[PDB]
Curated annotation (Swiss-Prot):
Portion held of the full protein: 1 to 141 of 187
GO terms for cellular component: core-binding factor complex; nucleoplasm; nucleus; protein-containing complex
Gene, per the UniProt record: Cbfb
Tissue-level expression: Expressed in all tissues tested. Highest level in thymus, but also abundantly expressed in muscle, lung and brain.
Protein name listed in UniProt: Core-binding factor subunit beta
Protein family (similarity comment): Belongs to the CBF-beta family.
Organism: Mus musculus (Mouse)
Length: 143
């Protein structure tokens, strides 16, 4: 009823949807992109592609390749403005980086989160709910 980009029961859909359930809580993940290059460059390029904005990252647990969307409620695309540490680009963590990208799959503002270790750009991540974006997107549904 004139409210896409959201569902009513967002917080139930977060736990209902097979898509989110396959990504689950804290599991193992891998990058899936320009990382398919040889090693040397792909480590720095990885944090540059993370800084571009959107990217593509997969899981291990179900092996769900998804397009990550480093687009906060102010969308940018112009190679990062000023997001969080954990969101994008945090001066570089302990041989890893932390990443955090709210997705709007079904009409659930989830958070995809994780750390991708720099070793090959594989690591750990999962979903959470974005309890603010869900409210904001419910507003932005011309409410």
């Amino acid at each position: 009823g004139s409210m896409p980009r959201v569902v009513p029961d967002q917080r139930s859909k977060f736990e209902n949807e097979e898509f989110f359930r396959k990504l689950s809580r804290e599991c193992e993940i891998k990058y899936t992109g320009f990382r398919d290059r040889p090693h040397e460059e792909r480590q720095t390029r990885f944090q540059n592609a993370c800084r571009d904005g959107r990217s593509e990252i997969a899981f291990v647990a179900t092996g769900t390749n998804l397009s990550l969307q480093f687009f906060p409620a102010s969308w940018q695309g112009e190679q990062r403005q000023t997001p969080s540490r954990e969101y994008v680009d945090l001066e570089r963590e302990a041989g890893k980086v932390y990443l955090k990208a709210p997705m709007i799959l079904n009409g659930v503002c989830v958070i995809w989160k994780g750390w991708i270790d720099l070793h090959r750009l594989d690591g750990m991540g999962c979903l959470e709910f974005d309890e603010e974006r869900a409210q904001q997107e419910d507003a932005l549904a011309q409410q």
